[PDB]
Homo-oligomer: A and B are copies of this chain.
Amino acid sequence: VHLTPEEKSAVTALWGKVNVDEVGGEALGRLLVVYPWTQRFFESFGDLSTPDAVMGNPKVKAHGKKVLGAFSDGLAHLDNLKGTFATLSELHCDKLHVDPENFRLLGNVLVCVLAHHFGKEFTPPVQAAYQKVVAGVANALAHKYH
């Protein structure tokens, strides 16, 4: 992932203001609502019938916080995402068999959640920076398939 310092500044500044405990659950929950086939991976989480059921699921919220945590991790090592994510790649690919396209969709939902939250501060160049990051993390997660 190649970010200019201006880009690195703007991404981290935005990041610093993310409600980590909420954003994660919102991004995971919206993934399940918007791209419904993804619910197949989380059937053990309980009731996912309605959007309300999904958005209200505390297992979804809890897990969402864990996803956001790893995201914060890659953000700290843009230099080496493959290695940062090596362990999560074996899990998601070798054990869970998640389609590589799903990693890209979660990336997308995340960018949407930020736009939604940071309105005007989510500028075109900031959107561009985050797009490159979510793409970099998605590619690092599908590494086991490469």
Contacts and interface: CB of A to CB of B under 8 A. Distances in A.
Q: Is the interface of A mostly helix, strand, loop or mixed?
A: helix
B51 A99 contact: no
Contacts of A74: none
A57 to B, nearest CB: 12
Contact of A97 (B1, B36, B97): B36
Contact of A2 (B117, B127, B146): B146
Interface in A12-39: 29-30, 33-39
A125 interface: yes
Interface string A77-120: 00000000000000001000111111000001001110111111
Contact of A34 (B97, B100, B127, B144): B127
A124 B37 contact: no
A99 B101 contact: yes
Among A99, A117, A125, A144, find the residue whose CB has the most chain B CB atoms closer than 10 A: A99
Given A1-B146, A116-B119, A33 B125 contact: yes
A67 interface: no
Interface string A49-62: 00100110000000
